[PDB]
Ligand binder design. Sequence first.
Ligand SMILES: NCCc1c[nH]cn1
Ligand SMILES: [Ca+2]
Length: 223
Amino acid sequence: IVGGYTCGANTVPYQVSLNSGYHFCGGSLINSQWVVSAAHCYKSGIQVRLGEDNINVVEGNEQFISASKSIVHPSYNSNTLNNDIMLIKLKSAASLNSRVASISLPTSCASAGTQCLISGWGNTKSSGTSYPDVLKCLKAPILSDSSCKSAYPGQITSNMFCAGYLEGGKDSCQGDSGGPVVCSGKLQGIVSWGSGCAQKNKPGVYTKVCNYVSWIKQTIASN
Ligand SMILES: NCCc1c[nH]cn1
Ligand SMILES: [Ca+2]
């Protein structure tokens, strides 16, 4: 997260870190056994880390649970990043509490102008490279479809939205991939892609989760 703030330990209780020897992506806990992330975060040997603040230090609220299976969206295209969504099932159910909690799925799509919270352990620099150990947060509005398409000609599908600031300075970045965009207590987005970070007229692009609720529910119900 570039131009954000330190969230505070366990203040974003649905935020997970995906770890394969190291943090490589964010995710969102949506029930005791399931995490939603980006399809471009797919790899084998995933351990889900819940209750994290400092990802380099065991602080006492963590639960580390190995993934039993991952399900990339059937229509995910890695070239265009269309349908950039994946489900991860935990080998055992997380113990839910005030610091490890699920986030609700949307019942309807959020509009341009809706204020959201984007979070992650990604790069905090727009030119250089610096990775924080503690969770970073950014409050950001959803941008209009028209401004999103104008920012990225030929690249924005009906399964994507832009959020952030056309002036630059505040954005998600490398390592935030797969993490949450939460608006009014609903998971509306997944950190998906952009052109660099926090650059003028290049806001972050997010997977439009409301399009996937039926798939998520049906997949969970049979797996
Ligand atoms: N807005 C950029 C988010 C991102 C994803 N991967 C790398 N960067
Ligand atoms: Ca920790």
